[PDB]
DNA sequence: TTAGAGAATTGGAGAGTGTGTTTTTTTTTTTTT
DNA sequence: CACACACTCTCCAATTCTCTAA
C-alpha cells in the first residue's frame, strides 16, 4: 500500500508507511548520537548504551547501584556510537497534488545507508 | 501547619467509623444473582467515605494503612462499642 | 601498571593463529602470581590484568598450544584459577559503599569477559584430554602433584561456570545461545561432560563428589526439570506454532485494552471544556462535587482518577524475583536432557550417597547442603517427568532425607528471622529446601500411582512415618505465620501454597482411606481440627496476596488458591474471616475482568462469598464496618 | 583522629570540561580508618560514607588559610579534590598530619540543633532549663513574664531575642551580656 | 500471642541560592532592460 | 536593577525497628 502526503495523519504515527514525493532540498550529512557511553564523574563507573530521545540524554541513574549521582556524567565521544543522519524536505508530486491547493511539504529523515541517496 | 495523618486518633473514630455506621443506612442492594453490581455500589460508597476522611491517599493505600490501624487501642475499642450499642 | 605491562609483554605474542612463547614465560608467570598474591584489597592487579586481557590474549593460547610444557601448563592453570576467582570471594561480600562496589563491578566485568572468551572448544578439549590422561592412572598411583592438578582443573571449570551473566547482554531473547549456552556447548563438544559423569559414577574417585555436584549445579543453573524433560525431536514445529499463537494472544489483549481506554476517554479533545455538579456526592467539604474530567469518566467515576500513588518506603518495598526465565538454545536443551537422563541412570545414587557422607563427616563447606537439596529437587522432578522409575532415586526416598530437609528448612527459617542482615539469602536457601520437600511429597504420590506393590508398600511406610511425626505437619503453619512479602518473593509464596495444597491432599486422602488415629507419648488426631489451624488471619492474608496476581498465576496455582479458600469457606464455615475490604477490591477486579470467563472457578467462588456477605449485610448493617479490619473470633461474633 | 567539618568533593575533570561546581560545602565527618589506610567521608546523604584510597596517592595540600577564615585544605588526588570549608584549626592540623603520615604509608555523628525555637505561650511549653546552650534565636509570646529571666539571658550565642506580647514591666541590665545579639523585640 | 512504649531512620516541607528576560534604507551588482 | 522559575540543602517530625508487658 501507498499513502498520500495528505494522509499522513496522527493515526499513522509509528506505523510502517510508504509515500511518494519530490525532493525539494537536502541538508548536510551529520553524525547523530544513537547511543552514548558515559563516565560517572564521582565514582568512575562507565555506563554504556544510553539510548537517545529527541533530546540529548545522559544516564538517569548511575550503573553502580549504591552511587547517588544523577546529573554529573561525561560523554566519551570515542567509545559512543553514531549514525549518519540527513534531513530532506519533500513535497507532493505533481500527479498527487489536489487541484487548487498549495503544495504540502514534509520533512524526511534519512539514516545510515540511505543518506545522500 | 498541622500535617495530617491517617492515624488512630485524628479522624478514624471522628469522621471515620461513626459516619461509616451511617453511610449504608440508605443503600440499595438487591441480593442474590446481582453480586457484581452490589459489590460495585459497595466499593463506590466505601471509596467515597475513605476519600472524604483522608483525601491524600488512593483507596487501596488507604485500605492497607487502615488494616494496620486495626491493631490500635482506640480503633478496636470503638469497634466493640459500635458492635454493642453506639 | 608499567611493570605488569612489561611482564605481560614478556609472555609472548600471537601471530595469525600460532602463539610464540618467550623462554622466560615461567618466571614472568610466577611474577604475575606474586603480584596477584600481593594485591591490594581493591584487587588492583586483578583489574589491571583483566583490562590488559592477558587471559584472552596469552594464557588461553599458551594453554591450548603449549600444553606439553608441563611446568608452564601447571603455572598457567594456577594463574587462571586465581584470575577467574569469583568476585564474591575476591571481596568477601557485596560492598555497601560506592568505591569498593565500583571495583567489584570492574572485576565482575572482566570475569564476564573471561566467560565470553572461554567458549572456545579447544580450551575445554585440552582440559578434558589432560584430565582424562590423568584419571587414566589408578588412585593409588596419584600423588599431590596430580591430586592438586585435578583440584585446580575442576576449580577452573567451576569458576568459569559460576560467573553471573552480564546485565548488558542478559537481554538475549529465548531460543538463542547465551554465553552460558555456548559454554555448555563447549563442554559438550569437548567431552568433559562424559568425564563429569565418570567422576560422579566412580567409587574410587568419590573424593571429588562435592566438586562434581557444584559443576552439575552450575551447569543446570537456568533450567526447569519438567520443561527440560519435555524436550525431544519434534519440538521445532511445536515451539514455532506456539510462538505465533502467543503473539496473536498478546496482540488481541493489547487491542482490547486500547479499545477500553478509547471508550473511557471521550471522542473530544482534552481542552474541550465543560463542568458538572454531581448533586448527591458531597465533596471533602459540605458542597456538592464539581467534576471537570469529562462526562465520559462519570460512568466509572472514582475519587482516585487524578491522584498520584504513594512512594512505598524502602523498608516496605516488596521483594522481586531475581531473574526472568528464557528458553535456552535447543541444541543445549537437548544436550542437557541427555546429560540429565544419563546422569540420573548411571550417577545419581552414588553421588547423593557420597555427598550425604561428606555432610555427615563434616568435610564440606558451610552451605553445601543447598547443593544437595537443589540436586534432590531437580533430578527427582526430572525422574517423575517422562519415564518415572523410583530405583533411579531410591537413595533419596528414605525418611532420613525428609528429616534432613525439615531440619535444614527450620534452621533457615530461624536464621532468616534472626540474622536479619542477610534475611533474603536465608530465604533463598529456605526456598531450595522447600522445593526439595515438595518434590519428595510429589514423588510419594507418583509411587502410589505406579503399579509396583513394593513401591506402594514403601510409600505407605514413609507416609505413615511423616504424617505421624509432628514437625512435618506444623512446619506449614510455622512458615505461613511468619512469611513476609518484604523479604520472600512471590515465587516462594507460590511454591509454599502449592506444597501446602499437595500435603493436605495427601493427608486428607490418607485419613479418608483409613483411620490411623494416633499421632506424635501419642495423642489422637483428626484432619478437621488440623485444618482449623489454617483458620488464622495471617494464612488467608498470604493466600489472597498470592491471589492478587491471578492474571499472571498458573492455572494450577489458581486452583490451589481457590480450593484452599473453598475448603475454609464451604467446609469450615469461615466466610467471615474472608469478608474483607481489600479482598472485596480484588473480587471487584475479578468481576470486572474482560477475561473473567477464563477464571470461572475464581469468579464463582467470589460470587458465592459475596452473596453470603450481602445476606449477612441485609440482616445486619454492622458487617460494613466489619469489612474494614482483619479479625480473630469476630468470625463467630458476626455469626 | 576524626574531624567534623563541611566538605566539598570536586572531580577535577569539571573545570577543563567547562562544568562549574556547587560552590559551598556540606556538613560532614572525616575518618582516617585502617589493614591499609582509608579516608571515610560521611554526610547527611550517606551515613555509610565514601572511602578514598590514600596509601600512595595524595597529589598535594593547600595550607594558606588553615587559620579557618575563608579556608580549606583543597586536597588533590587522582582524580578528586577534597575541600574542607570550615573546621577548627588545631584539630584540622592534627588531621592533616595524620593524612601526611598515611600517604607516606610506611608507618600506620554530625548531630546539631537549629538556630531557632518558638514559645507561642508558656502554658503550651515553658522554657525551663532544656534550651540548647548555644541557641541563636528564640521567640516567646503571650507569656506572663514580668521581667526577663536568666533562662534566656544565659544563652551564649543569641542573634534574636523576641518577647513580643509578653507582660514585661522592666528589663534587666544583664540582657546586655549577649555578645552577638542583633535583634531585640518587646 | 498481641500490641504498646522508647530509640533510630527516612520522607518531605520549606528555607535559601542562582539564572534570564524588553518591515526599511542606501548601496552594490548582474541580468534585463 | 526585579520578578518569576529552577535547584540544592537542611531540619523537623512521622513511620518503622527493637524490647517489654498485658
Ligand atoms: Zn556513579
Amino acid at each position: 500500500t501507498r499513502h498520500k502526503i495528505r494522509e499522513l495523519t496522527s493515526s499513522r504515527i509509528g506505523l510502517l508507511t510508504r509515500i511518494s514525493g519530490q525532493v525539494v532540498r537536502t541538508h548536510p550529512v551529520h553524525p547523530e548520537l544513537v547511543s552514548g557511553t558515559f563516565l560517572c564523574l564521582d565514582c568512575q563507573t562507565v555506563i554504556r548504551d544510553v539510548e537517545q530521545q529527541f533530546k540529548y540524554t545522559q544516564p538517569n541513574i548511575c550503573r553502580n547501584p549504591v552511587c547517588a549521582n544523577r546529573r554529573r556524567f561525561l560523554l566519551d565521544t570515542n567509545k559512543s556510537r553514531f549514525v549518519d543522519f540527513q534531513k530532506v524536505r519533500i513535497q507532493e508530486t505533481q500527479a498527487e497534488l489536489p487541484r487548487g491547493s498549495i503544495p504540502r511539504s514534509l520533512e524526511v529523515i534519512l539514516r545510515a545507508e540511505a543518506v545522500e541517496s | 501547619r498541622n500535617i495530617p495523618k491517617l492515624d488512630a486518633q485524628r479522624l478514624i473514630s471522628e469522621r471515620g467509623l461513626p459516619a461509616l455506621r451511617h453511610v449504608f443506612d440508605k443503600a440499595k442492594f438487591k441480593g442474590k444473582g446481582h453480586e457484581a453490581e452490589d459489590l460495585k455500589m459497595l466499593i463506590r460508597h466505601m471509596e467515597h467515605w475513605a476519600h472524604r476522611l483522608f483525601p491524600k491517599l488512593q483507596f487501596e493505600d488507604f485500605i492497607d494503612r487502615v488494616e494496620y490501624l486495626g491493631s490500635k487501642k482506640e480503633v478496636q475499642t470503638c469497634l466493640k462499642r459500635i458492635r454493642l450499642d453506639l | 601498571n608499567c611493570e605488569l605491562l612489561a611482564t605481560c609483554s614478556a609472555l609472548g605474542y600471537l601471530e595469525g593463529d600460532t602463539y610464540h612463547k618467550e623462554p622466560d614465560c615461567l618466571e614472568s608467570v610466577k611474577d604475575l602470581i606474586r603480584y596477584l598474591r600481593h594485591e591490594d584489597e581493591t584487587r588492583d592487579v586483578r583489574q589491571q590484568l583483566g583490562a590488559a586481557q592477558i587471559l584472552q590474549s596469552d594464557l588461553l593460547p599458551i594453554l591450548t598450544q603449549h600444553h606439553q610444557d608441563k611446568p608452564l601448563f601447571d603455572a598457567v592453570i594456577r594463574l587462571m584459577v586465581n584470575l577467574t576467582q569469583p568476585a564474591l570471594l575476591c571481596f568477601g561480600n557485596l560492598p555497601k559503599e560506592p568505591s569498593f562496589r565500583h571495583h567489584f563491578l570492574q572485576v565482575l566485568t572482566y570475569l564476564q569477559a573471561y566467560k565470553e572468551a572461554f567458549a572456545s572448544e579447544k580450551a575445554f578439549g585440552v582440559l578434558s584430554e589432560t584430565l582424562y590422561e590423568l584419571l587414566q592412572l589408578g588412585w593409588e598411583e596419584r600423588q599431590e602433584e596430580d591430586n592438586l592438578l585435578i583440584e585446580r582443573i575442576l576449580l577452573l571449570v567451576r569458576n568459569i561456570l559460576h560467573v553471573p551473566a552480564d546485565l548488558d547482554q542478559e537481554k538475549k531473547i529465548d531460543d538463542d545461545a547465551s554465553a552460558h549456552d555456548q559454554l555448555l556447548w563447549a563442554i559438550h563438544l569437548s567431552g568433559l561432560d562424559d568425564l563429569l559423569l565418570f567422576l560422579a559414577s566412580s567409587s574410587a574417585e568419590e573424593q571429588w563428589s562435592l566438586h562434581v555436584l557444584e559443576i552439575v549445579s552450575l551447569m543446570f543453573r537456568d533450567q526447569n526439570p519438567e520443561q527440560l524433560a519435555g524436550v525431544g525431536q519434534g519440538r521445532l514445529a511445536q515451539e514455532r506454532s506456539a510462538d505465533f499463537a502467543e503473539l496473536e494472544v498478546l496482540r488481541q489483549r493489547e487491542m482490547a485494552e486500547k479499545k477500553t481506554r478509547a471508550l473511557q476517554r471521550g471522542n473530544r479533545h482534552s481542552r474541550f471544556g465543560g463542568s458538572y455538579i454531581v448533586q448527591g456526592l458531597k465533596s471533602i467539604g459540605e458542597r456538592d462535587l464539581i467534576f471537570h474530567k469529562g462526562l465520559h469518566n462519570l460512568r466509572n467515576y472514582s475519587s482516585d482518577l487524578g491522584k498520584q500513588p504513594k512512594k512505598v518506603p524502602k523498608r516496605r518495598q516488596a521483594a522481586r524475583e531475581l531473574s526472568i526465565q528464557r528458553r535456552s538454545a535447543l541444541n543445549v536443551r537437548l544436550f542437557l536432557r541427555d546429560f540429565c537422563s544419563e546422569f540420573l541412570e548411571n550417577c545419581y545414587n552414588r553421588l547423593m550417597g557420597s555427598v550425604k557422607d561428606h555432610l555427615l563427616r563434616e568435610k564440606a563447606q558451610q552451605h553445601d547442603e543447598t547443593y544437595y537439596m537443589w540436586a534432590l529437587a531437580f533430578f527427582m522432578a526430572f525422574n517423575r517427568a517422562a519415564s518415572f522409575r523410583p530405583g533411579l532415586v531410591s537413595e533419596t526416598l528414605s525418611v532420613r532425607t525428609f528429616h534432613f530437609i525439615e531440619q535444614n528448612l527450620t534452621n533457615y527459617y530461624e536464621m532468616m528471622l534472626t540474622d536479619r542482615k542477610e534475611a533474603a539469602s536465608w530465604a533463598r536457601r529456605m526456598h531450595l529446601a522447600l522445593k526439595a520437600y515438595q518434590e519428595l511429597l510429589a514423588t510419594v504420590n507418583e509411587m502410589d500411582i505406579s503399579p509396583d506393590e513394593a513401591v506402594r508398600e514403601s510409600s505407605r511406610i514413609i507416609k505413615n512415618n511423616i504424617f505421624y511425626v509432628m514437625e512435618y505437619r506444623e512446619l506449614f503453619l510455622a512458615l505461613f505465620r511468619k512469611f513476609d512479602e518484604r523479604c520472600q518473593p512471590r515465587s516462594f509464596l507460590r511454591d509454599l501454597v502449592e506444597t501446602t495444597h499437595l500435603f493436605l491432599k495427601m493427608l486428607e486422602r490418607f485419613c479418608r482411606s483409613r483411620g490411623n488415629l494416633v499421632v506424635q507419648s501419642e495423642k489422637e488426631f483428626n484432619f478437621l481440627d488440623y485444618l482449623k489451624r489454617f483458620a488464622c488471619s495471617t494464612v488467608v492474608r498470604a493466600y489472597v496476596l498470592l491471589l492478587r496476581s491471578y492474571q499472571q498465576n498458573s492455572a494450577h496455582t489458581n486452583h490451589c488458591i481457590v480450593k484452599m479458600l473453598h475448603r475454609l469457606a464451604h467446609d469450615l464455615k469461615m466466610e467471615a474471616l474472608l469478608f474483607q475490604l481489600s479482598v472485596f477490591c480484588l473480587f471487584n477486579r475479578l468481576l470486572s475482568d474482560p477475561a473473567a470467563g477464563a477464571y470461572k472457578e475464581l469468579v464463582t467462588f467470589a460470587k458465592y462469598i459475596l452473596g453470603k456477605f450481602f445476606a449477612l449485610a441485609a440482616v445486619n448493617q454492622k458487617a460494613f464496618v466489619e469489612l474494614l479490619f482483619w479479625k480473630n473470633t469476630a468470625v463467630v461474633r458476626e455469626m | 583522629m576524626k574531624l567534623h567539618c563541611e566538605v566539598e568533593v570536586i572531580s577535577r575533570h569539571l573545570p577543563a570540561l567547562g562544568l562549574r561546581n556547587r560552590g559551598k560545602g556540606v556538613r560532614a565527618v572525616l575518618s582516617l580508618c585502617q589493614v591499609r589506610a582509608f579516608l571515610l567521608i560521611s554526610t547527611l546523604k550517606d551515613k555509610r560514607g565514601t572511602r578514598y584510597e590514600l596509601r600512595e596517592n595524595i597529589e598535594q595540600f593547600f595550607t594558606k588559610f588553615v587559620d579557618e577564615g575563608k579556608a580549606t585544605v583543597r586536597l588533590k588526588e587522582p582524580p578528586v579534590d577534597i575541600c574542607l570549608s570550615k573546621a577548627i584549626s588545631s584539630s584540622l592540623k592534627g588531621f592533616l598530619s595524620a593524612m601526611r603520615l598515611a600517604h607516606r604509608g610506611c608507618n600506620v555523628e554530625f548531630e546539631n540543633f537549629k538556630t531557632k525555637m518558638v514559645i507561642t505561650s508558656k502554658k503550651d511549653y515553658p522554657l525551663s532549663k532544656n534550651f540548647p546552650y548555644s541557641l541563636e534565636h528564640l521567640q516567646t509570646s503571650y507569656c506572663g513574664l514580668v521581667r526577663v529571666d536568666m533562662r534566656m539571658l544565659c544563652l551564649k550565642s543569641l542573634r534574636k531575642l523576641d518577647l513580643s506580647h509578653n507582660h514585661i514591666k522592666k528589663l534587666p541590665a544583664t540582657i546586655g551580656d549577649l555578645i552577638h545579639l542583633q535583634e531585640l523585640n518587646l
Side-chain angles (χ1 to χ4, degrees), chain A, chain B, chain C residues 1-311 313-639, chain D residues 1-73 75-186:
Chain A
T1 312
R2 192 176 91 242
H3 284 70
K4 291 150 66 176
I5 307 302
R6 304 282 162 166
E7 293 177 320
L8 296 175
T9 52
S10 301
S11 60
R12 302 299 304 181
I13 291 163
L15 276 54
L16 184 59
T17 308
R18 182 183 145 202
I19 55 172
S20 289
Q22 182 158 44
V23 184
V24 179
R25 171 55 63 83
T26 65
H27 297 77
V29 179
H30 298 107
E32 186 217 328
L33 183 66
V34 289
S35 68
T37 301
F38 289 87
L39 179 71
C40 185
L41 287 170
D42 56 16
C43 85
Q44 319 313 310
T45 302
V46 176
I47 310 98
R48 295 178 175 82
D49 298 357
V50 179
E51 303 297 317
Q52 302 295 303
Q53 207 71 72
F54 313 96
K55 222 298 197 286
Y56 158 75
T57 53
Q58 296 195 327
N60 184 265
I61 55 162
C62 183
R63 185 168 63 83
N64 189 334
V66 300
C67 181
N69 183 14
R70 301 192 76 178
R71 62 155 66 254
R72 293 174 297 283
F73 298 99
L74 174 61
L75 181 76
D76 191 356
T77 308
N78 293 74
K79 304 188 77 169
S80 302
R81 297 204 301 285
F82 292 84
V83 73
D84 305 305
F85 171 95
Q86 187 182 32
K87 60 181 283 175
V88 310
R89 303 297 300 197
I90 72 177
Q91 64 184 56
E92 293 162 301
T93 51
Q94 189 197 341
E96 289 188 353
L97 178 59
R99 293 184 285 124
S101 312
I102 297 95
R104 178 166 291 186
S105 63
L106 176 68
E107 178 169 316
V108 178
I109 303 300
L110 310 182
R111 274 181 175 158
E113 204 91 75
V115 301
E116 210 74 289
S117 291
Chain B
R1 188 172 65 174
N2 298 78
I3 301 296
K5 318 97 172 183
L6 171 51
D7 60 351
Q9 55 86 44
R10 188 216 170 196
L11 72 183
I12 186 160
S13 48
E14 290 73 29
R15 206 189 217 192
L17 283 309
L20 181 57
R21 164 59 189 83
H22 292 160
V23 157
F24 296 96
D25 290 336
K26 294 179 178 179
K28 310 174 73 172
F29 307 104
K30 52 167 68 62
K32 187 179 286 187
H34 313 269
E35 293 84 355
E37 61 177 68
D38 289 358
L39 178 57
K40 294 282 281 188
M41 188 183 292
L42 170 57
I43 290 290
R44 277 200 294 269
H45 280 78
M46 292 302 304
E47 189 198 298
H48 184 229
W49 163 79
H51 175 228
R52 298 191 75 263
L53 185 63
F54 200 60
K56 194 172 185 291
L57 298 172
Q58 291 193 354
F59 186 41
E60 279 86 343
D61 302 337
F62 172 90
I63 291 160
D64 296 355
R65 173 57 172 235
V66 85
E67 283 178 8
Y68 166 75
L69 292 180
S71 64
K72 304 305 294 290
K73 273 277 185 288
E74 302 94 329
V75 180
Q76 51 243 22
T77 49
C78 286
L79 182 60
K80 276 188 287 184
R81 181 167 178 165
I82 287 160
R83 270 199 285 269
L84 262 54
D85 41 1
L86 73 170
Chain C
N1 199 331
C2 52
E3 76 295 30
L4 278 309
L5 208 179
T7 48
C8 292
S9 307
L11 262 299
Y13 62 98
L14 186 66
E15 171 160 313
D17 60 354
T18 301
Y19 192 84
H20 297 86
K21 64 181 178 95
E22 307 294 357
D24 57 313
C25 269
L26 286 296
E27 52 262 45
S28 54
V29 167
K30 258 104 174 184
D31 292 338
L32 288 170
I33 292 163
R34 280 187 271 270
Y35 287 120
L36 284 166
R37 289 279 173 81
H38 296 299
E39 266 170 353
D40 191 4
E41 187 163 17
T42 62
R43 303 296 182 177
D44 58 336
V45 180
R46 220 156 287 270
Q47 296 178 45
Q48 282 164 3
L49 297 178
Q53 302 196 7
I54 55 152
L55 194 137
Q56 304 88 319
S57 307
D58 300 324
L59 281 48
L60 261 302
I62 292 157
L63 179 146
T64 51
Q65 302 187 352
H66 299 277
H67 56 276
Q68 298 87 348
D69 193 356
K70 306 300 182 66
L72 180 59
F73 185 85
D74 171 84
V76 165
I77 285 290
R78 284 184 284 114
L79 174 54
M80 286 180 76
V81 167
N82 196 330
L83 279 168
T84 58
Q85 186 172 353
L88 287 165
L89 295 184
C90 288
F91 291 85
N93 51 49
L94 273 157
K96 291 190 292 188
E97 64 92 20
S99 301
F100 267 146
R101 186 69 76 104
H102 161 56
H103 299 320
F104 180 92
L105 291 160
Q106 282 285 300
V107 175
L108 178 55
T109 301
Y110 302 133
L111 283 161
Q112 280 148 206
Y114 303 155
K115 198 193 200 172
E116 286 278 28
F118 240 101
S120 180
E121 189 271 337
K122 303 295 187 179
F124 278 94
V126 163
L127 292 165
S128 66
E129 284 288 351
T130 191
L131 196 108
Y132 168 80
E133 62 96 344
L134 195 165
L135 293 171
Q136 269 297 153
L137 308 179
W139 175 89
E140 70 284 4
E141 314 191 71
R142 307 190 215 295
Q143 302 184 10
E144 296 181 25
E145 181 173 27
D146 293 329
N147 286 330
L148 187 57
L149 182 52
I150 289 292
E151 274 203 47
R152 294 302 189 233
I153 292 284
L154 292 178
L155 284 168
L156 183 61
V157 176
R158 197 283 310 278
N159 285 2
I160 292 296
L161 279 165
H162 180 265
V163 180
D166 187 3
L167 77 94
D168 308 348
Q169 294 180 355
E170 66 179 3
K171 71 185 290 182
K172 306 213 83 190
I173 312 310
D174 57 8
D175 219 316
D176 193 354
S178 63
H180 195 81
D181 299 338
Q182 295 169 38
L183 182 62
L184 293 168
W185 197 242
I187 287 160
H188 164 69
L189 296 178
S190 64
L192 182 63
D193 56 330
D194 300 334
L195 298 173
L196 288 158
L197 269 81
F198 166 77
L199 285 163
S201 54
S202 178
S203 59
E205 295 295 340
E206 180 265 11
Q207 54 179 346
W208 317 118
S209 51
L210 297 173
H211 296 79
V212 171
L213 184 72
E214 190 166 39
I215 302 306
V216 171
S217 177
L218 298 168
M219 278 182 71
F220 290 92
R221 187 157 69 177
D222 299 358
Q223 271 56 54
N224 170 278
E226 284 85 346
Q227 294 173 9
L228 184 63
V231 175
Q233 301 297 112
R235 288 291 299 173
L236 281 165
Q238 295 179 3
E239 293 179 357
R240 181 62 55 73
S241 55
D243 290 331
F244 283 122
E246 182 167 37
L247 174 61
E248 262 292 321
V249 166
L250 292 157
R251 291 251 294 152
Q252 293 295 324
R253 193 188 299 150
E254 286 184 351
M255 288 168 178
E257 282 186 346
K258 188 173 182 179
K259 289 296 299 186
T260 53
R261 279 184 273 112
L263 292 172
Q264 183 61 22
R265 68 179 145 273
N267 59 349
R268 304 282 177 174
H269 69 289
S270 67
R271 292 189 194 79
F272 199 95
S275 312
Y276 310 90
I277 300 159
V278 181
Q279 295 186 125
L281 287 177
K282 299 179 73 169
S283 63
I284 60 166
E286 72 281 22
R287 300 176 67 75
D288 300 353
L289 182 72
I290 304 173
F291 198 80
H292 302 97
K293 299 182 171 70
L295 182 59
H296 44 83
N297 274 303
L298 286 164
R299 303 189 303 263
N300 287 318
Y301 174 74
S302 62
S303 298
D304 58 0
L305 277 158
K307 290 182 181 176
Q308 293 281 17
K310 76 179 187 186
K311 174 73 175 66
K314 185 275 300 170
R315 292 180 181 172
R316 305 309 191 82
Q317 290 173 198
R320 280 172 283 149
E321 287 73 32
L322 289 306
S323 184
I324 194 68
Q325 313 306 333
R326 52 169 287 280
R327 208 170 61 205
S328 58
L330 182 57
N331 302 89
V332 173
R333 281 188 286 156
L334 285 155
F335 153 68
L336 289 171
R337 188 206 66 173
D338 296 357
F339 189 105
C340 194
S341 163
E342 276 70 315
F343 174 90
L344 183 67
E345 286 181 354
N346 293 274
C347 313
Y348 183 62
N349 279 316
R350 199 191 301 285
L351 190 73
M352 295 297 277
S354 302
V355 173
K356 184 57 171 166
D357 293 335
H358 276 72
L359 268 290
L360 255 59
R361 294 162 73 175
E362 201 182 333
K363 43 164 64 186
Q365 294 191 11
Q366 189 172 347
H367 306 289
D368 290 338
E369 75 289 358
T370 63
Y371 295 122
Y372 185 77
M373 283 176 284
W374 171 88
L376 284 172
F378 197 97
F379 292 107
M380 296 186 75
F382 190 93
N383 184 24
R384 296 179 311 91
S387 56
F388 175 65
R389 304 186 207 120
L392 277 43
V393 299
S394 286
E395 282 288 0
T396 69
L397 299 173
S398 174
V399 299
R400 189 173 62 165
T401 63
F402 289 83
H403 186 273
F404 185 56
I405 296 154
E406 180 263 305
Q407 284 286 358
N408 294 332
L409 212 161
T410 52
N411 173 42
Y412 299 151
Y413 150 86
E414 295 154 21
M415 292 294 290
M416 191 231 298
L417 292 165
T418 52
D419 187 8
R420 301 179 194 129
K421 302 302 300 188
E422 59 171 66
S425 297
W426 287 112
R428 284 184 284 275
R429 297 174 194 132
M430 200 177 74
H431 192 184
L432 291 172
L434 177 59
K435 284 186 283 187
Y437 184 25
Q438 182 180 353
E439 282 301 330
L440 293 186
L441 299 166
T443 306
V444 309
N445 288 279
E446 199 68 23
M447 290 164 71
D448 291 357
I449 298 297
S450 71
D452 190 5
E453 293 84 354
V455 310
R456 289 177 178 187
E457 181 65 25
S458 46
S459 179
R460 196 261 276 99
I461 293 167
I462 62 190
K463 279 190 293 188
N464 275 252
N465 203 295
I466 268 56
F467 302 142
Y468 166 69
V469 176
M470 70 178 288
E471 287 84 339
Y472 303 108
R473 299 196 311 284
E474 300 294 333
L475 183 55
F476 294 94
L477 292 309
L479 290 173
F480 276 114
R481 288 183 292 92
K482 290 191 170 181
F483 159 82
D484 200 346
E485 178 72 342
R486 170 181 63 79
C487 179
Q488 287 142 293
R490 184 163 58 75
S491 56
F492 173 83
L493 183 57
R494 176 204 68 197
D495 292 0
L496 176 57
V497 162
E498 291 190 340
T499 310
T500 306
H501 173 272
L502 186 135
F503 187 80
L504 268 301
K505 172 65 75 172
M506 288 196 301
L507 183 134
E508 290 284 334
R509 194 248 297 185
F510 180 77
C511 296
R512 173 257 172 168
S513 175
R514 289 185 185 172
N516 282 330
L517 304 174
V518 306
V519 168
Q520 195 184 0
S521 303
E522 304 92 320
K523 60 181 291 302
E524 295 83 352
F525 171 84
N526 79 77
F527 51 85
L528 299 172
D529 75 77
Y530 178 60
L531 280 169
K532 282 175 180 178
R533 300 180 55 72
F534 291 85
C536 193
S537 61
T538 58
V539 54
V540 60
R541 186 167 174 175
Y543 267 84
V544 297
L545 180 67
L546 189 67
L547 187 64
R548 284 177 195 173
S549 60
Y550 72 98
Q551 205 74 244
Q552 308 91 321
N553 289 344
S554 81
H556 179 266
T557 310
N558 284 344
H559 186 243
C560 285
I561 299 157
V562 75
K563 178 57 178 178
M564 185 64 175
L565 298 176
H566 184 271
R567 199 189 298 277
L568 264 288
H570 184 273
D571 301 353
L572 279 84
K573 273 66 176 181
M574 299 298 287
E575 287 91 334
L577 188 74
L578 191 55
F579 291 169
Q580 285 291 280
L581 184 55
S582 49
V583 178
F584 276 24
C585 288
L586 179 51
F587 292 163
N588 183 31
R589 281 186 260 284
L590 262 161
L591 273 298
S592 306
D593 198 315
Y599 306 106
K600 182 65 176 188
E601 308 303 333
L602 275 57
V603 295
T604 46
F605 173 77
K607 286 202 291 189
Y608 165 81
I609 184 160
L610 287 163
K612 291 288 183 180
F613 175 74
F614 288 118
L616 176 60
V619 170
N620 170 29
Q621 48 70 29
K622 295 177 287 198
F624 299 116
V625 170
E626 296 294 349
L627 284 180
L628 196 62
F629 308 109
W630 295 101
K631 59 198 78 179
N632 305 339
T633 77
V635 183
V636 304
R637 162 61 175 82
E638 291 187 46
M639 304 308 91
Chain D
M1 177 263 287
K2 292 171 68 173
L3 178 66
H4 298 247
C5 59
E6 282 187 354
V7 72
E8 183 172 7
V9 185
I10 302 174
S11 195
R12 197 148 67 262
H13 292 72
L14 295 169
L17 272 290
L19 305 173
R20 189 169 178 268
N21 61 294
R22 183 176 62 212
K24 58 175 182 174
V26 160
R27 61 183 293 92
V29 294
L30 283 71
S31 310
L32 257 161
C33 295
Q34 63 184 244
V35 174
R36 306 285 73 176
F38 304 147
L39 167 55
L40 276 288
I41 307 188
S42 295
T43 76
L44 305 183
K45 300 173 182 289
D46 44 2
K47 169 59 173 179
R48 301 198 301 237
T50 35
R51 302 185 316 97
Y52 298 98
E53 321 309 336
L54 45 64
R55 186 85 291 189
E56 302 289 351
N57 59 275
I58 287 179
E59 195 72 0
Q60 55 169 294
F61 302 87
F62 297 80
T63 58
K64 188 58 55 55
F65 292 87
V66 165
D67 59 356
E68 294 294 323
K70 312 178 183 72
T72 196
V73 304
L75 167 57
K76 276 195 280 188
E77 301 177 14
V80 296
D81 182 357
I82 294 158
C83 323
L84 307 177
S85 45
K86 50 180 74 176
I88 56 174
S89 298
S90 58
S91 187
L92 184 129
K93 283 178 182 182
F95 184 84
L96 282 171
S97 303
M99 289 289 283
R100 289 167 176 173
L101 187 59
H103 162 57
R104 289 166 188 169
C106 183
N107 307 127
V108 294
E109 300 294 346
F110 46 77
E111 298 289 354
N112 199 43
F113 50 85
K114 191 176 174 172
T115 58
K116 168 262 185 177
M117 71 93 72
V118 57
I119 291 165
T120 320
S121 277
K122 185 177 175 184
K123 62 99 174 166
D124 294 331
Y125 180 81
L127 183 52
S128 186
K129 298 185 178 182
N130 304 97
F131 46 74
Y133 66 94
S134 187
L135 186 66
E136 312 283 334
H137 174 292
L138 84 152
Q139 175 72 70
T140 63
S141 197
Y142 304 99
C143 297
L145 280 74
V146 184
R147 176 165 164 273
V148 190
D149 288 357
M150 195 169 189
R151 303 174 196 278
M152 54 272 286
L153 245 62
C154 73
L155 299 170
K156 299 186 182 181
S157 195
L158 280 186
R159 271 93 188 114
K160 172 160 170 82
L161 170 54
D162 198 317
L163 308 312
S164 54
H165 302 287
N166 296 0
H167 301 163
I168 283 80
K169 287 282 282 293
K170 298 168 68 180
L171 71 96
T174 36
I175 188 173
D177 305 331
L178 303 170
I179 181 159
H180 296 137
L181 191 69
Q182 291 161 66
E183 214 302 309
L184 178 56
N185 176 16
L186 296 97

